Symmetry: C3
Subunit: 137 residues, 3 copies
């Protein structure tokens, strides 16, 4: 399925100097998120920093969620992943999307303004209601 999602641009560079997230191909599962920074940030081995995106989304449909994931190349080659490992975005969240960037490797890394630093997928979710039982089938 396809879905239109309302988005608010919070920093006027988003959609200009810092491109809006896009799907690379018709068959891509995820879109790439970019670092909305004024200057580069040096991240030493072991350290975590919070990177803004300059945007907010409103998924609004409670049957849908988004998940933020590391990029494959950054993660495998540079040890640049997420501090919370995976970021879960609720359908009712309307704040700025923030990225927890963590250096899990041994080499210092320069995070540049505008760099694709994470990816984000939209997946269907189910809200569970618990039915208390003494035994299962």
């Amino acid at each position: 399925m396809m879905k239109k999602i309302d988005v608010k641009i919070l920093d006027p560079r988003v959609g200009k100097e810092f491109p809006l997230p896009t799907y690379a191909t018709s068959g891509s599962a995820g879109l790439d998120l970019r670092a909305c920074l004024n200057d580069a940030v040096e991240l030493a081995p072991g350290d975590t920093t919070l990177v803004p995106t300059g945007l907010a989304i409103h998924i609004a449909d409670p049957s849908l969620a988004a998940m933020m994931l590391p990029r494959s190349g950054l993660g495998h080659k540079h040890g640049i992943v997420l501090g919370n490992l995976v970021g879960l975005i609720d359908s009712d969240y309307q704040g700025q999307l923030m990225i927890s960037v963590w250096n899990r490797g041994q080499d210092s890394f320069t995070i540049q303004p505008g760099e694709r630093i994470a990816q984000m997928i939209f997946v269907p979710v189910v809200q569970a209601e618990f039915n208390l039982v003494e035994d299962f089938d």
Copy 2:
């Protein structure tokens, strides 16, 4: 979609001193899981410990699964994540839900009884059957 899921309470504190997992809002994607412990557990930097939840679920429908994820604040601010990174819960699993808690940071952390230590989402899954071919389209 919404789904009723059978759950068995294994420790009589679950639903009393240790609240049952709940969705914070109507639009939340995940519910928070709590540590079912008799006493606090100190987790040093680099170490992993297995934390019980005091409950079992039976999803039962093979078109559904659950995934356990770190909490955002614990992960980003405290370096408190999962040892297996993401925990996959099969539709036919009927054992106690166990949480692999890992300190990926530099500061020792006290895991308290009743603390929300992870989150869990229910997602649709597809069972694949492989069709062997010499070439793709």
Copy 3:
């Protein structure tokens, strides 16, 4: 739901000495991926290595994706996880499936040929189109 997925065997050991991935039970969410290696690989604490699977898939339907995850036992007990944490497989990717294996613990680990080293789930995905607004509801 169930789905047939085209797969190409790239190494003639896959389906013979190295079994093809299978679901353990009718209710399993994921299938296990095996290391397609000529000889064992020793992975020291902190290090990452790229392990081939000897196969390619073509999901082809843009409403579906796959995610590669650590195994629970390897991750919790041995500190053997993924360097990119979670691996996202696009519906239009036709290359060999590669696994980023990372030792996040303190003990050296021997990766053997044919060993189940990761798992893979197929999940529905939604392609988002962004609708720019001044304010949300």
